[PDB]
A paper describes a structure:
The SARS-CoV-2 Non-structural protein 13 (NSP13) has been identified as a target for anti-virals due to its high sequence conservation and essential role in viral replication. NSP13 is a 67 kDa protein that belongs to the helicase superfamily 1B, it utilizes the energy of nucleotide triphosphate hydrolysis to catalyze the unwinding of double-stranded DNA or RNA in a 5′ to 3′ direction. NSP13 contains 5 domains, a N-terminal Zinc binding domain (ZBD) that coordinates 3 structural Zinc ions, a helical “stalk” domain, a beta-barrel 1B domain and two “RecA like” helicase subdomains 1 A and 2 A that contain the residues responsible for nucleotide binding and hydrolysis. A long 30 amino acid linker that does not adopt any secondary structure links the 1B to the 1A and 2A RecA-like core helicase domains.
A nucleotide bound form of NSP13 with the ATP analog AMP-PNP was determined to 3.0 Å resolution in a monoclinic crystal system with 4 molecules of NSP13 in the asymmetric unit. In mode A (exemplified by chain A of the nucleotide form) both AMP-PNP and a hydrated Mg2+ ion are bound, with the adenine base making stacking interactions to H290 on one side and R442 on the other. The γ-phosphate makes extensive interactions with the sidechains of Q404, R443 and R567 (from motif III, IV, and VI respectively). The Mg2+ ion is in an octahedral coordination and makes direct contacts to both the β and γ phosphates as well as the side chain of S289 and additional three waters. The conserved D374 and E375 from motif II (walker B) make further interactions with the waters and are poised to perform their presumed catalytic role of activating a hydroxyl for nucleophilic attack. In nucleotide binding mode B (chains B, C and D of the nucleotide form) the interaction environment of the adenine base and γ-phosphate are largely unchanged, with the ribose O2 contacting the side chain of K320. More directly related to the nucleotide status is the relative conformations adopted by the 1A and 2A domains which shifts by around 20° and adopts a closed conformation the Mg2+ AMP-PNP bound crystals structure, and a more open conformation in the APO, Phosphate bound and other AMP-PNP bound chains.
Numbering used by the authors: 2 to 203, 208 to 593
């Protein structure tokens, strides 16, 4: 027994065909079952024909007789429909209102999440539906991981190398660092977890959360996480204040964070505040300075990726007392991340943690950085677990989004990423930093006229070290990713002529190209995903292919805006090459 998801009308009915089983009132249950393929209803007992040897679970055929339910063919003459005239028989069959926006609920519950419009509706609906939509999406995504087959240990070559065998009749997941597996040891009458594992193609290379000596017969499946019911909203009700509440501002502040003191005051004058900033404009710098303006306040810094949280940790290292910081890493995951703070010291003034690894705790201010990669599920988790006085949502909708791996056909705008990005595109951000304080003028001019509507201002001047070369090269593939060796050879010859560029960071859309360029060039390699929130003096980027993946403007924007001094872009698509306001080089 619970509350309807479309009315809040008390009811005992749930839809069994919905993969989330939401409470539905008598009218809503009727409105849903008559217009969709969903016909199973769950009350105290599932509505099913009490006739011996009958299968009818469809509520549209069932009738009530005494204390049992019968189908259309096994019903007595005096028997009444369970679902008729617009309602469904159930507890509280009389406190049933009826929603006007049930058309939305039907589309959300029945869509496969392969079109952008399915995600548009999941962000433009009511708040009660946003939580439901995020549950259905995450459950759909987690259910789609079961379509891949099991991988078992066939042969152990060494430690960091394996031979795998694949469960028949099912496809194989892509082998790279993005996809994390779980290993199991087969016991007598059960199965026990061995840790976390990731695989790459050399015979496969492996790294584990443990040093376990995996033997033949152990198996790996994509790590699936529990979909939790969402209670707290994506955004709490907005409260505006008349003075600063709960916080005591500092008397003297450093000259770096002096330009944000007006915005820092606005943070403490309202329940939640949004800061939109183009790349390299000081959004994360804004977040760490907030701690210095409210020295007594306890701030929780969170983001959706371990990379973005590490970026905040690096800045916090420079500006905050190191003995007041902590990095929250989840139990028994090796995944290498910033360990210059105390690890898993939840009761510190400053806490740096990932969204899905958040502990249930209070804070004075909550800072959510890189908001473009967030989802409504993430926003709900943050309000659920972190109870704070102030919520600061920081990010750039024109940077990396959350991976919507089931989204296939169509283009989703940044305005439909999540409810916080929805505010930034409609009513505007509460705060805004419009001056890029990191990249040279050539990069800023490129991204300003490319994606930021010529509204991005540069603080740095032309460094004259931003170069672009047009070489398609030779594209070679292994399964998921791709490799362009001639484009790497261009960098190799370039690296001799510019010896100040072998400390540079190599960026590429494909991480097989990263591995190949790491072996031949021997440079530090970062993916666009792994470079988020980070800045490097010199960046070398090879586009590798002209595929739709490599030509993504947001992905391309993030990659080239990582450089603070110089960048070299080996482009394959002339459309993006000509839109680069760099200096062109000549072929040898
Ligand atoms: N007021 C400031 N004083 C000194 N350095 C600053 C200031 N604002 C920004 N910077 C520097 O400019 C760079 C950009 O800041 P940062 O906060 O990392 O960018 P960002 O807003 O997070 N862009 P992104 O990587 O998309 O998150 C960093 O090197 C900062 O140290
Ligand atoms: Mg940032
Ligand atoms: Zn349903
Ligand atoms: Zn209802
Ligand atoms: Zn029957």
């Amino acid at each position: 027994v619970g509350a309807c998801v479309l009315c809040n009308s008390q009811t005992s009915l749930r839809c069994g065909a919905c993969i989330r089983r939401p409470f539905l009132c008598c009218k809503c249950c009727y409105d849903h079952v008559i217009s969709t393929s969903h016909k199973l209803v769950l009350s105290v007992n599932p509505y099913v024909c009490n006739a011996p040897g009958c299968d009818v679970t469809d509520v549209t055929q069932l009738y009530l007789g005494g204390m049992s339910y019968y189908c259309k063919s096994h019903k007595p003459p005096i028997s009444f429909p369970l679902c008729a005239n617009g309602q469904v028989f159930g507890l509280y069959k009389n406190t049933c209102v009826g929603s006007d926006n049930v058309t939305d609920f039907n589309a959300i519950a029945t869509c496969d999440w392969t079109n952008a419009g399915d995600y548009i509706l999941a962000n433009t609906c009511t708040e009660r539906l946003k939580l439901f939509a995020a549950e259905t999406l995450k459950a759909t995504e987690e259910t789609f991981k079961l379509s891949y087959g099991i991988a078992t240990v066939r042969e152990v070559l060494s430690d960091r190398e394996l031979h795998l065998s694949w469960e028949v009749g099912k496809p194989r997941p892509p082998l790279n660092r993005n996809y994390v597996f779980t290993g199991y040891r087969v016991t007598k009458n059960s199965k026990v977890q061995i840790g976390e594992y990731t695989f790459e193609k050399g015979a496969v290379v492996y790294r584990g959360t443990t040093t376990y000596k995996l033997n033949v017969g152990d198996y790996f499946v994509l790590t699936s996480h529990t979909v939790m019911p969402l209670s707290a909203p994506t955004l709490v009700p907005q409260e505006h204040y008349v003075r600063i509440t709960g916080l005591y501002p500092t008397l003297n502040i450093s000259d770096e964070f002096s330009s944000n003191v007006a915005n820092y005051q606005k943070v403490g004058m309202q329940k939640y505040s949004t800061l939109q900033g183009p790349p390299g404009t000081g959004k994360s710098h804004f977040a760490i300075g907030l701690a210095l303006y409210y020295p007594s306040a306890r701030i929780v810094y969170t983001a959706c990726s371990h990379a973005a949280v590490d970026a905040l940790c690096e800045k916090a290292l420079k500006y905050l007392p190191i003995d007041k910081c902590s990095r929250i890493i989840p139990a028994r995951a090796r995944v290498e991340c910033f360990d210059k703070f105390k690890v898993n010291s939840t009761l510190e003034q400053y806490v740096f943690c990932t969204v899905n690894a958040l502990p249930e705790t209070t804070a004075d201010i909550v800072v959510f950085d890189e908001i473009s990669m967030a989802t409504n599920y993430d926003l709900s988790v943050v309000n659920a677990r972190l109870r704070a006085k102030h919520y600061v949502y920081i990010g750039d909708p024109a940077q990396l989004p959350a991976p919507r791996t089931l989204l296939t056909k169509g283009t989703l705008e940044p305005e439909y990423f999540n409810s916080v990005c929805r505010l930034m595109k409609t009513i505007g951000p509460d705060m805004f930093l419009g001056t890029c304080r990191r990249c040279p003028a050539e990069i800023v001019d490129t991204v300003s006229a490319l994606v930021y509507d010529n509204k991005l201002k540069a603080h740095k001047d032309k460094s004259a070290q931003c170069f672009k070369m047009f070489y398609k090269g030779v594209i070679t593939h292994d399964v998921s990713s791709a490799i362009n060796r001639p484009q790497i050879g261009v960098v190799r010859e370039f690296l001799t002529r510019n010896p100040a560029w072998r400390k540079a960071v190599f960026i590429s859309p494909y991480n097989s190209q990263n591995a190949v360029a790491s072996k031949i060039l021997g440079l530090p390699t970062q993916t666009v995903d792994s470079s988020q929130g980070s800045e490097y003096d010199y960046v070398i980027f090879t586009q590798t292919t002209e595929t739709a993946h490599s030509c993504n403007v947001n992905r391309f924007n993030v990659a080239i805006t990582r450089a603070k001094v110089g960048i070299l872009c080996i482009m394959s698509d002339r459309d993006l090459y000509d839109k680069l306001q760099f200096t062109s080089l000549e072929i040898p």
